[PDB]
Each structure stands twice: as C-alpha cells, then as structure tokens.
Amino acid sequence: TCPFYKKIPGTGFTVDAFQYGVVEGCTAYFLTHFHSDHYAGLSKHFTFPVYCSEITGNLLKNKLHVQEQYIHPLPLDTECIVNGVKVVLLDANHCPGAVMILFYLPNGTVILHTGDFRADPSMERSLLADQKVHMLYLDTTYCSPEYTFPSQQEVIRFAINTAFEAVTLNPHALVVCGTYSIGKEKVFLAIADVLGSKVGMSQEKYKTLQCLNIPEINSLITTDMCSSLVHLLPMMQINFKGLQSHLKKCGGKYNQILAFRPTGWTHSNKFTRIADVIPQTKGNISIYGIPYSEHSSYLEMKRFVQWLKPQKIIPTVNVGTWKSRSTMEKYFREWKLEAGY
Ligand code: NI
C-alpha cells in the first residue's frame, strides 16, 4: 500500500509510486527521474498519465517502451496547469532529466517535492525565491554530519589529471569508467575530452545515452570499442578478474588499464581527502574509487532547508526504521532553532 510520503494532499497526484498497482483516487502518477527504485513498476502496459521531464519521457518510451500518449513531458521552469492544479518542474541537479516539483494547491498550500537532489545555491535564485513553501518532501539520503564529500568540479579535476598523466606516460594504456544507471556522465565525458577520444560502450548504454539531449552527443560517444581509449563497463565488472577478462578481449591493443569507480560516500571519506587518493593494484590494472556524489552532503542539505524555512518536513529516504526517523527529526529541530523559523 502506497505510503503517505508518496501522496500529495488535496490532489489526485502521487510521486514515484509505480510499484503498488492502481492507487485509489490517483488521476496522475509523477516520476521525478529514471532510476529503478523510483520507476519500479512502469512498463508498456501503463494507461494512466505519467508526468515527467522530456528526458525522462524519452527513457520511458525507448527503454521501457511506454506509449507516446501517456507520457506527458513538461518543460522546466514553466508554470503549467495539470488537472487545474498549477505545477512547476525545476532542475534537481541529480542525473539527466531529474526534477523537483512545486505543487500549488487550490487551498493556498505550497508543497516542494525534491525527488533525488544535490542541493545548490543556484536553487536559491530560482522560482522558489518568489514565494513561501509550507511543506517539503526531502531527499534525506545523507542527513548526518559524517557525510561530507568534495564538489563535483574538484573531483572532475582529479580525474582529468590522473587520466591525462598516465595516457601521456604510457600511450598504450586504456581508461575504463564504471557505470550502472544514468548519472555521473560528466566523469567519462570530461576524461575523453582531455584524451582526444570518443567514449566506447555497449549497444544498450549507447541507446540510453542517445535519449538524454546532450548537445553534440554524436561526436562524443561510439559503439566501436576498437576506435576508442575511454571505455565504459558495468560496475559489477570493475574488478581484477572482470578487468582481466576485458583486457583480453581488446586483443593486444593496450598493455595497461586505469579504471575509475565513481561511488557515493564510503567510510574512507572520514579519514582521506580527494587529493590524497590511491587505487587497489593487482598487476597492471589500477582501480580508483572517486566520490562523485549526485546527492546533497549534510552541509548542502542544511543550508538549502535553512534558506527555505519550510513550516513542515517529510523525509523520503531512510524512513524505514524508527531510529533513522528519530535521528532525522533531531537534526530538523536543530536547524529550525538555529535559524529562527
Ligand atoms: Ni536517484
């Protein structure tokens, strides 16, 4: 049964709730972004409206094969009427096509649902700057002060450096980047840019990338592995036995891999900086973990919430245990007492 934190009061609307069957009263099923936890359930056999971004809609039509009529894409940053409820979609700074949704209820309540987001100061000069938000449905993935991690630009720096170093030192080395969903495309696009290359990938990943409205994408990516020296592989496969396997396939064309595992937080964020990173090493394969996050750090989240001064906060992540719920409420209370709202 659909949880209350996936329903919007005073509407027939639900958010990311595609895995329960029909939800009684639901005129509309919103989908914030194309990640399997949020979309779990959709297929070609949906015949209710889905409202989402254009990019999420391309993925619905081409990867899940939903029929064009039931995908209502909406532009971003545009006031839109949806069953005589005003809504706006705003960029979530998550993966491609990820949005937050502003709901303007008839009764005068305003609700923001963040979907998955990496909070940023550029959001403080968006359409949110214009009016009061009473209820916040909040991505609480890293709501604890241990969760720090670097900026995405800092990390793309490290990467462009490691890669360009090694390739210039050994011109027969391959760069590999791990992936398992959309997100984090900047890692591989940035490295390939510095190496004078396209990125090579499976047919299925090529298909996924061609749905994202990336400008100039035909010049950036290829399914011809042979012709490329930045390759993408499944994240499952980014290990020694699996990278050995792959290093064979390339047919004596490279004598060293240098891999990157963009990950979220790990416990080695607590004791090691990004400039002082190392990889595991079993022979000529060298696997880097680099903490490129598409969720808010604790500080980033804190700042956004203290700016917004919502009257009420509804967590959407880590809500499955009483201990996590309780810990989260305590931080929300501190933030409110500090900030005077
Ligand atoms: Ni996500």
From Swiss-Prot:
Metal-binding as UniProt keyword: yes
By what name is this protein known? DNA cross-link repair 1A protein
> How is this protein annotated for GO cellular component?
fibrillar center; nucleoplasm
Do the record's keywords include Amino-acid biosynthesis?
no
**Assembly mode:** Binds constitutively to TP53BP1. Binds CDC27, which is itself a component of the anaphase promoting complex (APC). Binds PIAS1.
GO terms for biological process, alphabetical: cell division; double-strand break repair via nonhomologous end joining; interstrand cross-link repair
What is this protein for, i.e. what is its function?
May be required for DNA interstrand cross-link repair. Also required for checkpoint mediated cell cycle arrest in early prophase in response to mitotic spindle poisons. Possesses beta-lactamase activity, catalyzing the hydrolysis of penicillin G and nitrocefin. Exhibits no activity towards other beta-lactam antibiotic classes including cephalosporins (cefotaxime) and carbapenems (imipenem).
Q: Which residues of the full protein are shown?
A: 700 to 1040 of 1040
Q: In which tissues is it expressed?
A: Expressed in brain, heart, kidney, liver, pancreas, placenta and skeletal muscle.
Among the GO molecular function terms of this UniProt record, one is: zinc ion binding
Sorted keywords for this record are: Cell cycle, Cell division, DNA damage, DNA repair, Hydrolase, Isopeptide bond, Metal-binding, Mitosis, Nucleus, Phosphoprotein, Ubl conjugation, Zinc, Zinc-finger
Subcellular location as annotated: Nucleus
Membership in a protein family? Belongs to the DNA repair metallo-beta-lactamase (DRMBL) family.
Task: Explain what induces or represses this protein's expression.
Answer: During mitosis. The mRNA encoding this protein contains an internal ribosome entry site (IRES) in its 5'-UTR. This 5'-UTR generally suppresses translation while specifically promoting expression during mitosis, when cap-dependent translation may be impaired.
